[PDB]
Amino acid sequence: PTPATPNVPANFAVCEGDNITLSTSTVASSYNWSGPNGFTSNVQNPVVITNATTSNAGVYTLSIVDGNGCESGDTTVTVTVDSIPVTPVLSSNSAICFGDTLELSTTALATSYEWIAPDGSRITTGTNILSISSNNSLYQSGDWMLVTTNASGCTSMPSSVATVVINANPAQPA
Amino acid sequence: PTPATPNVPANFAVCEGDNITLSTSTVASSYNWSGPNGFTSNVQNPVVITNATTSNAGVYTLSIVDGNGCESGDTTVTVTVDSIPVTPVLSSNSAICFGDTLELSTTALATSYEWIAPDGSRITTGTNILSISSNNSLYQSGDWMLVTTNASGCTSMPSSVATVVINANPAQPA
């Protein structure tokens, strides 16, 4: 009696750098997995493919051997590995006389942009330009960073550090 | 009945540094691959040859063993590994009085040249010299880089950083 085909996850997808986890919920004397990049395993819970890249995309196939020595039919999961946005570049107005608007911007294209304040505050915007008024809690000098997200929800590496200089206005002289 | 010869990809080609992926779409009890640099594999989807170099160029051969124990005839894919342009050198006019034309150039030969602005903007040209007028959005001071592309579409390593200095014109004195 040919065994039942194994229960394997539905098609999925990860971003370059994340982990591809394969598993089955069925019970067998032995399991037989095969796939892209030479992947192979003889267990229910194969070693996780870390730092997954585009060469790990493809079709992962499983069959099992039951207690009566018979092999089951096949089932597969298609796994894809999407892209990471190009590390964005952050251009700050840097030198700014206190009271002048602080304008942080990029040239990167993205679904959304995450700006990181020197104190760690993060403001999420849909556009390139972040305009910070002088009475805002984000009107901070120091080291600023940008992370961008694409259509698939993949996040970029953080940008290099842009620096902002907010200068004091000299006091009314005697 | 000798099995059918396997389905293997058409001749291809990669640039030095890219990945050589081999595969077959046929079904066998076992697969037998052999090739350049000592390459060997016994699966449909052999481990990918990463950072491919010129020693990986050559003829990759596949035969398979079917369920009746018979071996198939042979089929091959020829794989070549092309060249990478020599890392180009970028010479910038550096010190420039605002209003003077900014002229970035190289000595490298290429099919096309990609110039990278300090803010990340990239302008693609067919020649050595990029001439940026003073009213252009690219008239930027700071760190500039060049990447070149050859006839086969191979991209160079980025050049070292050239620096540009745009100087201010002093104000009309009292």
Helix (H, G, I), strand (E, B) or coil at A90: strand
Interatomic CA distance for residues B127 and B56, integer angstroms: 33
**Which method, experimentally, gave rise to this model?**
cryo-EM
Task: Tell me whether B40 touches chain A (CB under 8 Å).
Answer: no
Interatomic CA distance for residues A168 and A141, integer angstroms: 11
Angle at A27 (CA atoms; ends A22, A32), nearest 5 degrees: 50
Gyration radius (Cα) of chain A, Å: 26
Which two three-digit tokens encode residue A149? 């997200």
Instruction: Inspect the interface and report whether the beta carbons of B120 and A38 lie closer than 8 Å.
Output: no
What is the DSSP annotation of A42-58? Answer: SSSSPPPB-S--GGG-E
Name chain A contacts of B41, Cβ cutoff 8 Å.
38
Contact call for residues A16 and A49 (beta carbons, < 8 A): no
From the CB of residue B7, how many other CB atoms can be counted at a distance below 10 Å? 11
Listed residue (A54, A7, A8, A64) closest to A32, CA to CA:
A64
Kindly give, in sequence order, each residue whose CB lies less than 8 Å from that of residue A12, ignoring residues fewer than 6 positions away: A77, A79, A80
Nearest to A36 among B45, B119, B120 (CB): B45
Nearest to B119 among A34, A37, A89 (CB): A89
Contact call for residues A169 and A96 (beta carbons, < 8 A): no
Interatomic CA distance for residues A59 and A56, integer angstroms: 9
Interatomic CA distance for residues B106 and A119, integer angstroms: 42
Please name every residue paired with A15 in a beta bridge, in sequence order, or none if there are none: A82
| End-to-end CA separation in angstroms for chain A | 101
Smallest CA–CA distance, residue B121 to chain A, in Å, is 7
Please name every residue paired with B49 in a beta bridge, in sequence order, or none if there are none: B20
Smallest CA–CA distance, residue A66 to chain B, in Å, is 19
> φ, ψ for residue B168 (rounded to 5)?
-80, 150
CA A58 to chain centre: 19
Which residues in chain A belong to E strands, given as ranges? 12-15, 30-34, 40-41, 58-65, 75-82, 90-92, 96-97, 102-106, 112-116, 122-125, 130-132, 142-149, 162-164, 166-167
Could you tell me which chain B residue has the CA closest to the CA of A105? B119
3-class SS string, chain B: CCCCCCCCCCCEEEECCCCECCCCCCCCCEEEEECHHHCEECCCCCCCECCCCHHHCEEEEEEEECCCCCECCCEEEEEEEECCCCCCCEEECCCEEECECEEEEECCCCCEEEEECCCCCEEEECCCCEEECCCCCCCCCEEEEEEEECCCCCECCCCCCEEECEECCCCCCC
Nearest to B119 among A35, A36, A91 (CB): A91
> φ, ψ for residue B37 (rounded to 5)?
65, 20
CA distances for A102 relative to A94, B21, B89, B154, angstroms: 8, 49, 36, 41
Interface-testing mutation among B25, B45, B49, B137, with chain A (most A C-beta atoms within 10 A): B45
Nearest to B45 among A37, A106, A108 (CB): A37
Angle at A51 (CA atoms; ends A48, A52), nearest 5 degrees: 75
Task: Tell me whether A55 touches chain B (CB under 8 Å).
Answer: yes
β-strands B90-92, B102-106 pairing: antiparallel
CA distances for B132 relative to A108, B97, B102, B116, B137, angstroms: 21, 13, 5, 13, 9
DSSP A37: G
Give me the residue label for tokens 């191979």: B154
Contact call for residues A35 and A60 (beta carbons, < 8 A): yes
Task: Tell me whether B47 touches chain A (CB under 8 Å).
Answer: yes
- Tell me the longest C-alpha to C-alpha distance in chain B: 101
Contact call for residues A16 and A82 (beta carbons, < 8 A): yes
Which two three-digit tokens encode residue B9? 């990809």
Task: Tell me whether A155 touches chain B (CB under 8 Å).
Answer: no
β-strands B75-82, B12-15 pairing: parallel
β-strands A112-116, A122-125 pairing: antiparallel
DSSP A27: -
DSSP A171: P
